[PDB]
Amino acid sequence: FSIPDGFKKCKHLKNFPLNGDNKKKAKQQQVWLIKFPSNVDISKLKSLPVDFESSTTMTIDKHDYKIMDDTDIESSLTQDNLSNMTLLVPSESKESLKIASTAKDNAPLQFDKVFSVSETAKIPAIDYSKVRVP
Amino acid sequence: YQRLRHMVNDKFQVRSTGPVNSLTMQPVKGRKRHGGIRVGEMERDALIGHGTSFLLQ
Amino acid sequence: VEILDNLSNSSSGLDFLQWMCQIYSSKSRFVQNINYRSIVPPFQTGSRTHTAKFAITYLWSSLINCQKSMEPTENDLLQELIDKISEWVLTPPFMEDAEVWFIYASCHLLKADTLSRQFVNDNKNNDLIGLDRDIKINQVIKHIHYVRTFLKICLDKGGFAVPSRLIENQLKSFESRLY
Amino acid sequence: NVFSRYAISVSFRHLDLIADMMTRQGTYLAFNRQGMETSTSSFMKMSYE
Amino acid sequence: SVVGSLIFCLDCGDLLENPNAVLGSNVECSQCKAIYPKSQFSNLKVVTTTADDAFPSSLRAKKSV
Amino acid sequence: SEIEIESVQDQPSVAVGSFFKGFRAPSDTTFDLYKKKKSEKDEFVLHGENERLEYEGYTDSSSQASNQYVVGLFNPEKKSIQLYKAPVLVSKVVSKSSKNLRGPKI
Amino acid sequence: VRKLLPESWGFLCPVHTPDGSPCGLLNHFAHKCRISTQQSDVSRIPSILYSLGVAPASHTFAAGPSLCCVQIDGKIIGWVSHEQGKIIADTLRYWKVEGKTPGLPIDLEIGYVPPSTRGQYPGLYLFGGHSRMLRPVRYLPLDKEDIVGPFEQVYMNIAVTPQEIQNNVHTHVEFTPTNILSILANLTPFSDFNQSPRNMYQCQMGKQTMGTPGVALCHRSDNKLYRLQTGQTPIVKANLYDDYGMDNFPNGFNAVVAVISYTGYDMDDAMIINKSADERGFGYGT
Amino acid sequence: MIVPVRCFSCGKVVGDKWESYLNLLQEDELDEGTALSRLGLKRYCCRRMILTHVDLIEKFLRYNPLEKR
Amino acid sequence: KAQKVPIPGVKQALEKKEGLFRKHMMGKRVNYAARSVISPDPNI
Amino acid sequence: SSRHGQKGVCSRKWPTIDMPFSETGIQPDIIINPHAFPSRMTIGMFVESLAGKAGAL
Amino acid sequence: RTADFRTLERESRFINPPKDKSAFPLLQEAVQPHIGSFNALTEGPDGGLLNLGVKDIGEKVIFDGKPLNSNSGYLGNKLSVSVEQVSIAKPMSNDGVSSAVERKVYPSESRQRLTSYRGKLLLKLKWSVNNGEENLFEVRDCGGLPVMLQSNRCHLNKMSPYELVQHKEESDEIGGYFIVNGIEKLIRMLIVQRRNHPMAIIRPSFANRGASYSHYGIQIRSVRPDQTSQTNVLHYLNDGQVTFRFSWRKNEYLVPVVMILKALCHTSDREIFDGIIGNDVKDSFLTDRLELLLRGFKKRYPHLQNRTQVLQYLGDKFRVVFQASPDQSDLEVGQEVLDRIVLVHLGKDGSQDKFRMLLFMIRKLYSLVAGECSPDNPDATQHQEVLLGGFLYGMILKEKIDEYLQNIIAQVRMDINRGMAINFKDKRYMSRVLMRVNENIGS
Amino acid sequence: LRLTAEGNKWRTDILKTSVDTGREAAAEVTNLDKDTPADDPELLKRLQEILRDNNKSGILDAVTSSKVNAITSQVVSKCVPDGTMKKFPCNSMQAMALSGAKGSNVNVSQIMCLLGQQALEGRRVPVMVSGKTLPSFKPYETDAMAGGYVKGRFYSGIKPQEYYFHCMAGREGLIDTAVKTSRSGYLQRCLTKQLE
RNA sequence: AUGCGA
Ligand SMILES: [Zn+2]
Ligand SMILES: [Zn+2]
Secondary structure, three states: OOOOOOOEEOOOOOOOOOOOOOOOOOOOOEEEEEEEOOOOOHHHOOEEHHHHOOOOEEEEOOEEEEEEEOOHHHOOOOOOOOOOEEEEEOOOOOOOEEEOOOOOOOOOOOOOEEEEEEEOOOOOOOOHHHHOOO | OOOEOOOOOOOOEEEOOOOEOOOOOOEOOOHHHOOOOEEOHHHHHHHHHOOOHHHHO | OHHHHHOOOOOOOHHHHHHHHHHOOOOOOOOOOOOOOOOOOOOOOOOOOOOOHHHHHHHHHHHHHHHOOOOOOOOOHHHHHHHHOOOOOOOOOOOOOOHHHHHHHHHHHHHHHHHHHOOEOOOEOOOOOOOOOOHHHHHHHHHHHHHHHHHHHHHHOOOOOOOHHHHHHHHHHHHHHHO | OHHHHOOOOOOHHHHHHHHHHHOOOOOOOOOOHHHHOOOOOHHHHHOOO | OEEOOEEOOOOOOOOOOOOOOOOOOOOOOOOOOOOOHHHOOOOOOOOOOOOOOOOOOHHHHHOOO | OOEEOOEEEOOOOOEEEEOOOOOOOOOOOOEEEEEOOEOOEOOOEEEEEOOOEEEEEEOOHHHHOOOEEEEEEEEOOOOEEEEEEOOEEEEEEEEOHHHOOOOOOO | OOOOOHHHOOOEOOOOOOOOOOOOOOOOEOOOOEEOOOOOOHHHHHHHHHHHOOEEHHHHOOOOOOOEEEEEOOEEEEEEOHHHHHHHHHHHHHHHHOOOOOOOOOOOEEEEEOOOOOOOOOEEEEEOOOOOEEEEEEEOOOOEEEEEOHHHHOOOOEEOOHHHOOOOOOOEEOOOHHHHOOHHHHHOOOHHHOOHHHHHHHHHHHHOEOEOOOOOHHHOOOOOOOEEOOOEOOOOOOOHHHHOOHHHOOOEOOOOEEEOOOOOOOOOOEEEEEHHHHHOOOOOEO | OOOOOEOOOOOOEOHHHHHHHHHHHHOOOOOHHHHHHHHOOOOHHHHHHHHOEOOOHHHHHOOOOOOOO | OOOOOOOOOHHHHHOOOOHHHHHHHOOEEOOOEEEOOOOOOOOO | OOOOOOOOEEEEEEOHHHOOOOOOOOOOOEEEOHHHHHHHOOHHHHHHHHHHHHHHO | OOOOOOOHHHHHHHHOOOOOOOOOHHHHHHOHHHHHHHHOOOOOOOOOHHHHHHHHHOOOOOEOOOOOOOOOOOOOOEOOEEEEEEEEOOOEEOOOOOOOOOEEOOHHHHHHHOOOOEEEEEEEEEEEEHHHOEEEEEEEEEEEEEOOOOOOOOHHHHOOHHHHHHOOOOOOOOOOOEEEOOEEEOOOOEEEEOEOOOEEEEOHHHHHOOOOEEEEEEEEEEEOOOOOEEEEEEEEEOOOOEEEEEEEOOEEEEEEHHHHHHHHOOOOHHHHHHHHOOOOOOOHHHHHHHHHHHHHHHHHOOOOOOHHHHHHHHHHHHHHHHOOOOOOOHHHHHHHHHHHHOOHHHOOOOHHHHHHHHHHHHHHHHHHHHOOOOOOOOOOHHHEEEEOHHHHHHHHHHHHHHHHHHHHHHHHHHHHOOOOOOOOOOHHHHHHHHOOOOOOOOO | OOEOHHHHHHHHHHOOOHHHHHHHHHHHHHOOOOOOOOOOHHHHHHHHHHHHOHHHHHHHHHHHHHHHHHHHHHHHHHHHHHHEOOOOOOOHHHHHHHHOOOOOHHHHHHHHOOOEEOOEOOEOOOOOOOOOOOOOOOOOOOOOHHHOEEOOEOOOEOOHHHHHHHHHHHHHHHHHHHHHHHHHHHHHHHHHHHHO
């Protein structure tokens, strides 16, 4: 196969310390998903107000932002594994991705926290005293 | 005030004699054909209403 | 036509050229068949394939008649030539390709330069424009984008006439002036 | 009742006759073509529907 | 996978033939080759309800005030 | 209360993939990664095979240009995230049975 | 079908309607309604929505009335919360009234449908395509023109004049309430002073009036023309009478009218003309 | 079509007062009311005649087919 | 009863909606008749 | 008809001497029966009368 | 001083009409919805609406009946045909035929002569032989197309008022109408369902379709870039079955929606379930109706294991009616059908997007059936758009060019069934057949 | 056509009471406490439930109608020849209505007092699915006017929100008037053939 | 039949 007369094989991957500080239900590690407009430079961040849990408003290059945190879609207090947002873990630059897990239980894990950066906008209120002239 | 184009005043028509349809021998229709106004079904009914059967005939 | 170019007095081969165009459109598609033995010459005839060459010379002489003493409402000529070539729009002329499309673009490319001059020297005319943003830059970028469409369709449709490399370099070094 | 709803006066002679014609056969003989069938004038049948 | 009273092929996602109707003590996918509950045994149940609309009545109107 | 960012990793390593609700695949299933270096970026396509089926996944190009995904692993005790850019690929799985066809006509 | 609906406010004229069979069938556009003849800038909207937090339809991979569907021209691009649905609708309208987002044509129609108990099915339906009926309204937060279409109008609070603006409610106001009338309905002076059906018969008469059809009549060959020679400009007129130049084609004349029963030949619908005036050319026509 | 000779309502000859009337609106930069007062149109029938007039004949006149153009 | 807009036969001529009976028999055009817009007049 | 959809035929061409004359020395151009307004409620036409009168004066 | 007379302004404008721009810009802007629409058939994106239409009608293929004596079976050469470009020219008249300098024709002449105001309609015909072994272009003149006044194709579109008067016109001529045989006609605008958007409708005709039909259904009126539309209906059968309605050759056809779903993209049933119910996995009403749908489809077609087989079934069942035969396989006929019927508003290669929209329509339909959402109103202006006359014009043109090529194909078929005298490569034959069909589309 | 200064005092002052009337009726049909705030969330949910039911909506129209029509009757009974600027043996409009030359006391009240409640097919103004009867009205506005009750009168004009409704009544009137004769011709003929 | 006066 090795299709798309526009693709190259992979040659460079990176180890994932999945278990160097993991312990089964003992290390409170997390994996997060965040959506970033291309307009932001992720490498130019320093910390993340995800700790606001909900009030994760954020200001990036004097631009005001909101960091959407959602339980839905994958932390629902309703079903076991409500996601197909599959994690594909590598190993080496010469090996293909792997299905995420926490032991050899053939079960896909979920992201502890899912965040989404949404650019806020002023949409300033109407100054009634100016508009409502009699 | 504006004068409406429908001067139906000018649209008056009278026929005391004129052409006839070949399949009926009855007055043709239309002002321009000097046709004759129609006695419709209801006007017939009304003439019977009055009892004026010699007027209806 | 030359006698009227050499005749510094009365007439612009143009008139005579535009009189010919109407006197030899012959928008009829034909050729071959009978013994063309008094009208052979691809120097009279055409319209329905066979490009006439006095009609191509009429457009070429007309763009050169537009250039002289422009950028050195009685104007119109570079528009008159945009609408006289448009009355065409494929049939026999564009229906046929080249010079037709090409000099159309060339008349169009000249109309883009004049508008960069009339909004060029030392940022447009001079110190800036403030003059309501740049409605004039947008009118010119629309054109520059269009003319690149006419030069491209003239290439695509088999047109060997155009040395694309030079015209693209000129147009980019010119778009620059517009910055 | 139908006319009274619109506060229209209609002499009972009219309605009462009409009803008598609807019962001419001892039934609820409507006025459409179906009821017309049993009347005896053939041209009247021809000239309705 | 089982949802409600549907159970999908785990490998292919096909709504595999219902375990209750198989002619074997096994279930296999028509898209995949997986063998029934074998690993685990479904007990398909659904708590179906009325739409709370089909049954208009004066008493339902007495439930609204 | 805001979480600090410890480290960011910018080059391809981990990926994320949408699948049917129930996807689990063999204990060993392998995921072929590909790379495209177009203009200034790179488009990724995933491909895998199993004993019956074969799964191939690719990026929603119109959303890639308008959104970019980042994943990190945070420690509460170290307050540190290893940030990872991962392409999300909607991958579909075809089987060997999905490779049969009829005649060219009736 | 003939029932006049409130959706038509600003789109069809409530008084320009024929009388007869067509009543309700032959609607008439308002004098300020516009029709899209092109489509534009659909290409950048996915990018901006994604920036605003729309989850791409491949990744949400979930659907329901419990969630807002973002669609552009009927191309479903993503899903969001209904709360984020409305925030997007409003911030999008802000970027429309602004001039900074060229991927955002002023004439974009932004269909927000909020969640409603047994209401219209929620979603954010944007539209940019052709044949949309579009009308201007004044967007108050930027005090600038905004184009609204009939779909989005249902859920938009448009004050009819600035003094009736309710706090925290009307987001726009009509430029002029005459924008809801068709042309002929605007030409009628004090049209808000007559019983409605008389205004609609007014449209039928003024539309049936012998007037000046043109001035190129020596170069037409109509099967019939009616040309009033003595044409005048009403003393009482709408200013739209000038703005449409109907004075080029005067259709009537200013007459001295006595509202008087006096002669006994003017009953019900019959009126009398002055003899000397008629002899002097009053309403004279060819 | 062209300024009527007389006021329909009254009978007063008015056709003479058009051109001077237009002059009075041009030359003196007067207002229509005062111009009509100086022309003697002291009745509103005469008033409306000239005030409301629509001299469409000038617009007709450009269509004269008997001269090259 | 045959097998676009085939010339009508005698059944269509005689009925079709109203028919020859209704359109040329139960009512006809008549001679010695006129039609005009009516105008009031109190002195007659 | 006026601009108010109050249409009527001209019943007669009244001699000017027979018209009513105002103390301004005029006799009307058109006379419209008042009895039309109570059903139609064309009060806009009344307002147009008073506005056209002001506007001529 | 509130509505004062513009009196001097008028007399100045009457005596000396504008030489640069008419006043009353609303007056021209009022018919803008007509004129602009007609301009969209000749100018705009790609080439204008009419050229997009001719790019979408594609080709009409015909095989000289395979002969060559595999020669026969594998077609006796392919004869690709098509229409590349469509040009419209401003009205011209040359007298005494060829050799009569042409003159630009102005409307006043069409009126005085009491005749139509026609523009020569030309279209670049592509005669493709053996799929490309030999390409033939010919622009054929298709008679006079009636042109809209002040359109991008009438001489008066760009005339200043002064010039317009110099051309014997009303200094303000709005145009937008057609002079046909001297009588001025315009195309009446029509209110049609708003395009491209699913409108939830309850209609008793849906019950009139037959047994197991409910009232509920979804109607989306997809219109192509070229503005031709194709309405698609979903019906909820009382039995839980969902049927897809469409119209072809003005005939109706019903297909199970699960077929068009498995046909659009390769997918699992669990992918359709996730597309429909999503996180809503708890609606026994919806879970169970969906079980009826999927289990029933698996019941009917147990052998349709993959999308390809499905496409083959659609091609197999519609090849008799899409007239693609003597060339296409059931897979090709199937795919072209999908592209030609299902959510055409999303366009070719929108097959995943058409997939998402189709799942959204089934889900909305179940929301209508359950009653969790109100029904929409076909007659509310909310749910309506306006077919502009000019677009109707463009549609009828697109269909007529389809007929013109269909007539070529018919002519070749008749010739091959009575003579087969000549091969598709001869140019003489091109002229011979081409001169034997009626090409007067202008009339 | 004019009223006295007194006649305008009574007319405006009585029309001052309908402002409560609109919601008061909405809370009666909703079956919620008196003076219930115009913005109670329960009020809005009950009223959306009401919009979704055609019969419940009919009751809401009928009660609101009876009450505002009580306001009409009040206004006319007060202002009538009791407030006209000139009376009978001189007021021609009254003369024509009261003599029955032309008009009715209804017309005279529509010119001199108020138009009152527009109605369609037997009930109040149609409502859009957003809960708004016109763009300018917030959803479920409890104002009588937003339902179509016109307080303006022909002598002083009607606001555009009211002109858009009076256009409704005028149209639906023209529809019934223009269609009834086609269904009454066959009523004549079907028995006219028989009893002739 | 399409539009329209009554
Ligand atoms: Zn399987
Ligand atoms: Zn006078």
